[PDB]
């Protein structure tokens, strides 16, 4: 029921990262967003390994809440929200900072 998808990306394996928290799809700030974070996302979606982790709303801007920020994944986590971060709904971003991924399974 805590879910994740990629949107405005062209296939399911690349897009803006969004997370279903408490009935709402919300976004992820790009502040420490790297390919370790994007691997956790790609692995958790079954899209494999990450080819990049673009910041600056490269797949546009969400209009939900911003649900995660300062994500600092070791790389071995199952789910993005199990990584270290500043806690649910704690962020210092706007949606222009929304984080995205491209995965291997993207065409």
mmCIF file of C-alpha atoms in Angstrom:
data_model
loop_
_atom_site.group_PDB
_atom_site.id
_atom_site.type_symbol
_atom_site.label_atom_id
_atom_site.label_comp_id
_atom_site.label_asym_id
_atom_site.label_seq_id
_atom_site.Cartn_x
_atom_site.Cartn_y
_atom_site.Cartn_z
ATOM 1 C CA UNK A 1 0.000 0.000 0.000
ATOM 2 C CA UNK A 2 3.056 2.279 0.230
ATOM 3 C CA UNK A 3 3.687 2.392 -3.506
ATOM 4 C CA UNK A 4 6.002 4.108 -6.006
ATOM 5 C CA UNK A 5 5.789 4.918 -9.712
ATOM 6 C CA UNK A 6 7.496 7.031 -12.420
ATOM 7 C CA UNK A 7 5.400 9.533 -14.399
ATOM 8 C CA UNK A 8 5.675 11.878 -17.427
ATOM 9 C CA UNK A 9 8.541 9.669 -18.501
ATOM 10 C CA UNK A 10 7.459 7.843 -21.650
ATOM 11 C CA UNK A 11 7.724 4.376 -20.150
ATOM 12 C CA UNK A 12 7.097 3.005 -16.654
ATOM 13 C CA UNK A 13 10.906 2.708 -16.201
ATOM 14 C CA UNK A 14 11.740 6.428 -16.351
ATOM 15 C CA UNK A 15 9.967 9.484 -15.020
ATOM 16 C CA UNK A 16 9.404 11.744 -12.044
ATOM 17 C CA UNK A 17 9.531 9.738 -8.827
ATOM 18 C CA UNK A 18 6.210 9.684 -6.948
ATOM 19 C CA UNK A 19 5.251 7.889 -3.764
ATOM 20 C CA UNK A 20 1.817 7.041 -2.375
ATOM 21 C CA UNK A 21 1.721 8.212 1.238
ATOM 22 C CA UNK A 22 -1.605 8.389 3.052
ATOM 23 C CA UNK A 23 -3.852 8.545 -0.040
ATOM 24 C CA UNK A 24 -1.672 11.006 -2.009
ATOM 25 C CA UNK A 25 0.911 10.663 -4.723
ATOM 26 C CA UNK A 26 3.740 13.027 -3.722
ATOM 27 C CA UNK A 27 7.197 13.841 -5.038
ATOM 28 C CA UNK A 28 10.848 13.579 -3.956
ATOM 29 C CA UNK A 29 13.254 16.530 -3.676
ATOM 30 C CA UNK A 30 16.512 16.299 -5.609
ATOM 31 C CA UNK A 31 18.814 17.649 -2.879
ATOM 32 C CA UNK A 32 21.174 14.586 -2.452
ATOM 33 C CA UNK A 33 19.570 12.666 -5.242
ATOM 34 C CA UNK A 34 22.152 10.419 -6.943
ATOM 35 C CA UNK A 35 22.223 7.092 -8.809
ATOM 36 C CA UNK A 36 22.310 5.107 -5.535
ATOM 37 C CA UNK A 37 18.869 6.538 -4.773
ATOM 38 C CA UNK A 38 17.856 5.860 -8.422
ATOM 39 C CA UNK A 39 19.051 2.200 -8.173
ATOM 40 C CA UNK A 40 16.877 1.552 -5.114
ATOM 41 C CA UNK A 41 13.946 2.983 -7.136
ATOM 42 C CA UNK A 42 14.776 1.021 -10.334
ATOM 43 C CA UNK A 43 15.392 -2.211 -8.395
ATOM 44 C CA UNK A 44 12.155 -1.739 -6.384
ATOM 45 C CA UNK A 45 10.193 -1.219 -9.630
ATOM 46 C CA UNK A 46 11.816 -4.190 -11.395
ATOM 47 C CA UNK A 47 13.347 -1.907 -14.034
ATOM 48 C CA UNK A 48 16.854 -3.159 -13.093
ATOM 49 C CA UNK A 49 19.711 -0.644 -12.557
ATOM 50 C CA UNK A 50 19.668 3.170 -12.992
ATOM 51 C CA UNK A 51 21.252 4.954 -15.989
ATOM 52 C CA UNK A 52 20.775 8.377 -14.423
ATOM 53 C CA UNK A 53 19.132 10.321 -11.585
ATOM 54 C CA UNK A 54 18.078 13.717 -13.051
ATOM 55 C CA UNK A 55 17.090 16.583 -10.722
ATOM 56 C CA UNK A 56 15.411 19.880 -11.677
ATOM 57 C CA UNK A 57 12.064 18.393 -12.551
ATOM 58 C CA UNK A 58 13.386 16.810 -15.770
ATOM 59 C CA UNK A 59 10.027 14.995 -16.102
ATOM 60 C CA UNK A 60 8.073 18.090 -15.021
ATOM 61 C CA UNK A 61 6.621 19.134 -11.675
ATOM 62 C CA UNK A 62 4.329 17.152 -9.442
ATOM 63 C CA UNK A 63 1.383 18.851 -7.809
ATOM 64 C CA UNK A 64 1.106 16.628 -4.752
ATOM 65 C CA UNK A 65 2.866 17.134 -1.437
ATOM 66 C CA UNK A 66 6.610 16.698 -1.354
ATOM 67 C CA UNK A 67 6.941 13.550 0.776
ATOM 68 C CA UNK A 68 10.726 12.861 0.888
ATOM 69 C CA UNK A 69 13.936 14.928 0.908
ATOM 70 C CA UNK A 70 17.710 14.448 1.460
ATOM 71 C CA UNK A 71 17.564 10.794 0.401
ATOM 72 C CA UNK A 72 20.900 9.126 1.086
ATOM 73 C CA UNK A 73 20.444 5.439 0.131
ATOM 74 C CA UNK A 74 23.308 3.030 0.827
ATOM 75 C CA UNK A 75 22.199 1.175 -2.302
ATOM 76 C CA UNK A 76 21.067 -2.128 -0.727
ATOM 77 C CA UNK A 77 17.599 -0.976 0.553
ATOM 78 C CA UNK A 78 14.419 -2.641 -0.812
ATOM 79 C CA UNK A 79 12.325 0.515 -0.821
ATOM 80 C CA UNK A 80 13.212 4.215 -1.304
ATOM 81 C CA UNK A 81 11.451 5.165 1.989
ATOM 82 C CA UNK A 82 13.636 2.682 3.952
ATOM 83 C CA UNK A 83 16.696 4.763 2.938
ATOM 84 C CA UNK A 84 17.880 7.634 5.211
ATOM 85 C CA UNK A 85 16.006 10.871 4.654
ATOM 86 C CA UNK A 86 14.769 13.868 6.602
ATOM 87 C CA UNK A 87 11.502 12.081 7.454
ATOM 88 C CA UNK A 88 8.112 11.942 5.740
ATOM 89 C CA UNK A 89 6.829 15.393 4.647
ATOM 90 C CA UNK A 90 9.976 17.154 5.885
ATOM 91 C CA UNK A 91 11.571 19.095 3.070
ATOM 92 C CA UNK A 92 12.945 22.492 2.086
ATOM 93 C CA UNK A 93 12.153 22.302 -1.626
ATOM 94 C CA UNK A 94 9.637 23.315 -4.212
ATOM 95 C CA UNK A 95 8.434 21.156 -7.089
ATOM 96 C CA UNK A 96 10.970 22.613 -9.512
ATOM 97 C CA UNK A 97 13.390 20.429 -7.509
ATOM 98 C CA UNK A 98 11.416 17.203 -8.109
ATOM 99 C CA UNK A 99 13.661 14.153 -8.646
ATOM 100 C CA UNK A 100 13.417 11.607 -11.482
ATOM 101 C CA UNK A 101 15.119 8.402 -12.678
ATOM 102 C CA UNK A 102 15.989 6.689 -15.928
ATOM 103 C CA UNK A 103 16.280 2.875 -15.650
ATOM 104 C CA UNK A 104 17.890 0.127 -17.873
ATOM 105 C CA UNK A 105 14.529 -1.309 -18.821
ATOM 106 C CA UNK A 106 13.796 2.103 -20.431
ATOM 107 C CA UNK A 107 13.951 1.793 -24.158
#
